[PDB]
RNA sequence: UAGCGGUUCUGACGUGCAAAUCGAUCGUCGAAUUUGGGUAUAGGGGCGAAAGACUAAUCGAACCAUCUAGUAGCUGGUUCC
RNA sequence: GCAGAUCUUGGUGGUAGUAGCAAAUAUUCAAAUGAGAACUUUGAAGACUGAAGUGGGGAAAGGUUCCACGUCAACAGCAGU
RNA sequence: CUGAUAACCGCAGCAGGUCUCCAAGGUGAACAGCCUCUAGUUGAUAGAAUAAUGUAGAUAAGGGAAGUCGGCAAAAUAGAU
RNA sequence: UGUACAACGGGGUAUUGUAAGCAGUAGAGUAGCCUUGUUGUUACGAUCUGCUGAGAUUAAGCCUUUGUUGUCUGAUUUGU
């Protein structure tokens, strides 16, 4: 009565899709996410979960803007255009 | 050579379905008419007719009649002929009583 | 689930469009090692957990 | 062939359910051709597919038994398995006694 | 009766249909009744018509990660002539 | 440097072509397709669930299972068109 | 679209669990049991023999609990006036 | 190729218990008619009586049979 026929009654969701991190870790009755922490102002990371800081940190996504920083540093943050030389 | 002789019979299914489970009497009545015709006609392929499959099963699985008249024909097979060229074809003949009927070669002319 | 929100139906659209084998012409490409679709999801075998 | 679809559509077109349709095995090649409901409505019209009329549940022993019970049979003590208030309550006999007198 | 329990056979099964199910028998059956959803309460803390019972097959003290390769007078191994 | 730590990962044996594939009353004849039909499809029988149904709709859950065409390597603990 | 002994959960197409609406005729006190109409299935590996020992179902002359820890299991009993 | 064997039919044995069908001044009565009765009849009517120790079944591990119809040369292995 505590094994398979109790797994019978099990049709609801404690968690649904987080809006910030998109993981199904967002607790419905609590109204908070367990993986990232939404709707907190922060994003929860703990030094005991060093693999969490491997999964969810910088470099793991697209880096839609940081990718063009070091390149943009190398030129000393140029502004303007370029001239034409030959051919 | 030809051997297309067609005969009538009284198969006595009382003594063939004795002691057999009630949900297996009419299936064995079918599988016993096949063995009966393989005995008489000698061929291996037996074809029953669906009117006989009705007359076996007039009374459920367990109400197979004691005696059935049969018209058995022995006819040859063609058009990608079988493992044996001849086969039997078993039909009923309608009668109010299968009691008291000797076997008879049928005249077909 | 038979009466849904748009977020769920949009994720179903994405899980349906991914539900195909390889395009066959990727099997011929220069420096290939892709042999099949490794991220196949059936609906009997593996639930998506939305 | 494989006439799953056509038996389904023929039930859904005639309106009688699937247990009463009749797709005759002589014209069966034609029935494999008739794939849409607009073809099935022709095959029901001419006679390739019919209705298979109702299994008769004749209430003619019901009527004969009730005709006997109207003349007062089948009402001894073994034909009677519930308490006398359960067959006809005392409250209904009192209601009928007294609304009549009143 | 439906339902909700689960007594007895110490019945079946016991490398099962099933990490507790099946059959028969049985208790209760309009109320301190059953039950959906919502919600509240969270770990030495909840919650308990109390059995140290239940807390997601985990409970006289949940689960996960880290300190942590914890310590071991105690078992077991410990590689060619 | 290896023979064993109920050592780790992997692989392969005997047992063994055995234990098993036995709840839910039940299937049979013909024809069609096909390389091949105890199982497909149609027809004829026989039956069952018997309107707290094995019937019609749905909530939760699932996610394309819905419907047609083509097709049987792998799945459907036998088979399979 | 399914809403479940194959579409959800139980590692599985797992005899488990899981909220609710409509609901015919007869018998009968009755939504009981038994039979049928409307709908829906005919799916659960099969063929042949049918010895042991089993599981489920039964019956027994005469005695009747002497059986056993204990009448455990069956039997009887039963509806209505 | 045989007073063989088989399948049916026949006879005996055996179980049960008098079939279906038809008939009857039998049938508690009930109605319905008429000369209304001194069995007055028609129709209904569980049942009963006559045919009916009838009918059914009878071998699957019963017996017997000159009857009717059939059957009777398929595969393999073996030596000092």
Swiss-Prot record, chain A:
Q: Which Gene3D superfamilies match?
A: 2.20.25.30
* MF-aspect GO terms: RNA binding; rRNA binding; structural constituent of ribosome; zinc ion binding
Compartment(s) of residence: Cytoplasm
A Pfam family this chain is assigned to: Ribosomal_L37e
Instruction: Extract one GO cellular component term from the record.
Output: preribosome, large subunit precursor
Question: Where are zinc fingers of the kind C4-type found along the chain?
Answer: 18-36
* InterPro entries per record: Ribosomal_eL37, Ribosomal_eL37/eL43, Ribosomal_eL37_CS, Ribosomal_zn-bd
Q: Per its Swiss-Prot or TrEMBL entry, what cofactor is needed?
A: Zn(2+)
Sorted UniProt keywords: Cytoplasm, Metal-binding, Ribonucleoprotein, Ribosomal protein, RNA-binding, rRNA-binding, Zinc, Zinc-finger
Predominantly, its location class is cytoplasm
Per the annotation, how and in what number is the cofactor bound? Answer: Binds 1 zinc ion per subunit.
User: Biological process GO terms, please?
Assistant: cleavage in ITS2 between 5.8S rRNA and LSU-rRNA of tricistronic rRNA transcript (SSU-rRNA, 5.8S rRNA, LSU-rRNA); cytoplasmic translation
Keyword RNA-binding in record: yes
Other remarks on this protein: Present with 21800 molecules/cell in log phase SD medium. There are 2 genes for eL37 in yeast.
Q: How does it assemble?
A: Component of the large ribosomal subunit (LSU). Mature yeast ribosomes consist of a small (40S) and a large (60S) subunit. The 40S small subunit contains 1 molecule of ribosomal RNA (18S rRNA) and 33 different proteins (encoded by 57 genes). The large 60S subunit contains 3 rRNA molecules (25S, 5.8S and 5S rRNA) and 46 different proteins (encoded by 81 genes).
> Per its record, how is this protein called by name?
Large ribosomal subunit protein eL37A
Q: Report the source organism.
A: Saccharomyces cerevisiae (strain ATCC 204508 / S288c)
Lineage per the UniProt record: Eukaryota, Fungi, Dikarya, Ascomycota, Saccharomycotina
From Swiss-Prot, chain B:
Q: Which GO terms describe its molecular function?
A: structural constituent of ribosome
Subcellular location, record wording: Cytoplasm
What organism is this sequence from?
Saccharomyces cerevisiae (strain ATCC 204508 / S288c)
- An example Gene Ontology biological process: cytoplasmic translation
Per the record, the coiled-coil ranges are: none
Query: Which lineage is the organism of this entry classified under, starting from the top rank?
Result: Eukaryota, Fungi, Dikarya, Ascomycota, Saccharomycotina
Question: Per UniProt, which keywords does this protein have?
Answer: Cytoplasm, Ribonucleoprotein, Ribosomal protein
In terms of Pfam families, this protein maps to: Ribosomal_L31e
In which family does this protein belong, per the annotation? Belongs to the eukaryotic ribosomal protein eL31 family.
Subunit structure and binding partners: Component of the large ribosomal subunit (LSU). Mature yeast ribosomes consist of a small (40S) and a large (60S) subunit. The 40S small subunit contains 1 molecule of ribosomal RNA (18S rRNA) and 33 different proteins (encoded by 57 genes). The large 60S subunit contains 3 rRNA molecules (25S, 5.8S and 5S rRNA) and 46 different proteins (encoded by 81 genes).
**What's the further remark here?**
There are 2 genes for eL31 in yeast.
User: What does the entry list under GO cellular component?
Assistant: cytosol; cytosolic large ribosomal subunit
Q: What does this protein do?
A: Component of the ribosome, a large ribonucleoprotein complex responsible for the synthesis of proteins in the cell. The small ribosomal subunit (SSU) binds messenger RNAs (mRNAs) and translates the encoded message by selecting cognate aminoacyl-transfer RNA (tRNA) molecules. The large subunit (LSU) contains the ribosomal catalytic site termed the peptidyl transferase center (PTC), which catalyzes the formation of peptide bonds, thereby polymerizing the amino acids delivered by tRNAs into a polypeptide chain.
From Swiss-Prot, chain C:
Q: What is the organism lineage in this UniProt record?
A: Eukaryota, Fungi, Dikarya, Ascomycota, Saccharomycotina
Question: Major place of localization?
Answer: cytoplasm
Q: Which family does it belong to?
A: Belongs to the eukaryotic ribosomal protein eL39 family.
Its GO CC terms are: cytoplasm; cytosol; cytosolic large ribosomal subunit
Keyword annotations: Cytoplasm, Ribonucleoprotein, Ribosomal protein
Self-association state and partner proteins as the record states: Component of the large ribosomal subunit (LSU). Mature yeast ribosomes consist of a small (40S) and a large (60S) subunit. The 40S small subunit contains 1 molecule of ribosomal RNA (18S rRNA) and 33 different proteins (encoded by 57 genes). The large 60S subunit contains 3 rRNA molecules (25S, 5.8S and 5S rRNA) and 46 different proteins (encoded by 81 genes). eL39 interacts with YIH1.
Q: Name one GO molecular function term.
A: structural constituent of ribosome
Pfam short name (any one): Ribosomal_L39
The record's InterPro entries line, in alphabetical order, gives: Ribosomal_eL39, Ribosomal_eL39_CS, Ribosomal_eL39_dom_sf
Subcellular location(s) per record: Cytoplasm
UniProt keyword Chaperone present: no
PROSITE patterns per record? RIBOSOMAL_L39E
| PANTHER family documented for this protein | LARGE RIBOSOMAL SUBUNIT PROTEIN EL39, RIBOSOMAL PROTEIN L39E
Q: Which gene encodes it?
A: RPL39
Per its UniProt entry, which superkingdom is the organism in?
Answer: Eukaryota
Can you say what this protein is called? Large ribosomal subunit protein eL39
Has UniProt tagged this entry with the keyword Ribosomal protein?
A: yes
Compositionally biased residues, Basic residues: 6-19
Biological process (GO) annotations held by this record are:
cytoplasmic translation
The segment annotated Disordered runs over: 1-21
Record organism: Saccharomyces cerevisiae (strain ATCC 204508 / S288c) (Baker's yeast)
What Gene3D superfamilies does its record include? Ribosomal protein L39e (1.10.1620.10)
Curated annotation (Swiss-Prot), chain D:
Q: Which GO terms describe its cellular component?
A: cytosol; cytosolic large ribosomal subunit
Question: Where can the Glycyl lysine isopeptide (Lys-Gly) (interchain with G-Cter in ubiquitin) cross-link be found?
Answer: 20, 52, 59
- Localization, UniProt: Cytoplasm
- Which GO molecular-function terms appear in the entry? RNA binding; structural constituent of ribosome
Provide the residue span(s) of the region labelled Disordered: 57-84
Q: Domain of life of the organism in this record?
A: Eukaryota
Q: Which residues carry this modification: Phosphoserine?
A: 29, 36, 90
What other facts are recorded?
Answer: Present with 97700 molecules/cell in log phase SD medium. There are 2 genes for eL19 in yeast.
Question: What is annotated about its quaternary structure and interactions?
Answer: Component of the large ribosomal subunit (LSU). Mature yeast ribosomes consist of a small (40S) and a large (60S) subunit. The 40S small subunit contains 1 molecule of ribosomal RNA (18S rRNA) and 33 different proteins (encoded by 57 genes). The large 60S subunit contains 3 rRNA molecules (25S, 5.8S and 5S rRNA) and 46 different proteins (encoded by 81 genes). eL19 lies in close proximity to the binding site for eukaryotic initiation factor eIF4G.
What biological function has been recorded for the protein in this entry? Component of the ribosome, a large ribonucleoprotein complex responsible for the synthesis of proteins in the cell. The small ribosomal subunit (SSU) binds messenger RNAs (mRNAs) and translates the encoded message by selecting cognate aminoacyl-transfer RNA (tRNA) molecules. The large subunit (LSU) contains the ribosomal catalytic site termed the peptidyl transferase center (PTC), which catalyzes the formation of peptide bonds, thereby polymerizing the amino acids delivered by tRNAs into a polypeptide chain.
User: Could you identify this protein by its name?
Assistant: Large ribosomal subunit protein eL19A
């Amino acid at each position: 009565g505590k094994g398979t026929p109790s797994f019978g009654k099990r049709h609801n969701k404690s968690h649904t899709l987080c809006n910030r991190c998109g993981r199904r870790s967002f607790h419905v009755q609590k109204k908070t996410c367990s993986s990232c922490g939404y709707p907190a102002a922060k994003t929860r990371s703990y030094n005991w979960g060093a693999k969490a800081k491997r999964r969810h940190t910088t470099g793991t996504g697209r880096m839609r803007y940081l990718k063009h920083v070091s390149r943009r540093f190398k030129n000393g943050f140029q502004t303007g255009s370029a001239s034409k030389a030959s051919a | 050579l030809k051997d297309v002789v067609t005969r009538e019979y009284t198969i006595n299914l009382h003594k063939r379905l004795h002691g057999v489970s009630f949900k297996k009497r009419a299936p064995r009545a079918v599988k016993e008419i096949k063995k009966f015709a393989k005995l008489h006609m000698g061929t291996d392929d037996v074809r029953l007719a669906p009117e006989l499959n009705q007359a076996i099963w007039k009374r459920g699985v367990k109400g197979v009649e004691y005696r059935l008249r049969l018209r058995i024909s022995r006819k040859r097979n063609e058009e990608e002929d079988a493992k044996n060229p001849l086969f039997s074809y078993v039909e009923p003949v309608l009668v109010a009583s299968a009691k008291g009927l000797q076997t008879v070669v049928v005249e077909e002319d | 689930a038979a009466q849904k929100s748009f977020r769920i139906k949009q994720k179903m659209a994405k899980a349906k469009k991914q539900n195909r084998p390889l395009p066959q012409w990727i099997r011929l490409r220069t420096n290939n090692t892709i042999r099949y679709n490794a991220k196949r999801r059936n609906w009997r075998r593996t639930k998506m957990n939305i | 062939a494989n006439l799953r679809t056509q038996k389904r559509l023929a039930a859904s077109v005639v309106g009688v359910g699937k247990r009463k349709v009749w797709l005759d095995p002589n014209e069966t090649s034609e029935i494999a051709q008739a794939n849409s409901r607009n073809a099935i409505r022709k095959l029901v019209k001419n006679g390739t597919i019919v209705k298979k009329a109702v299994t008769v549940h004749s209430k003619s022993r019901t009527r004969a038994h009730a005709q006997s019970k109207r003349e007062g049979r089948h009402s001894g003590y073994g034909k009677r398995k519930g308490t006398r208030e359960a067959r006809l309550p005392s409250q209904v006999v009192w209601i009928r006694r007294l609304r009549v007198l009143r």
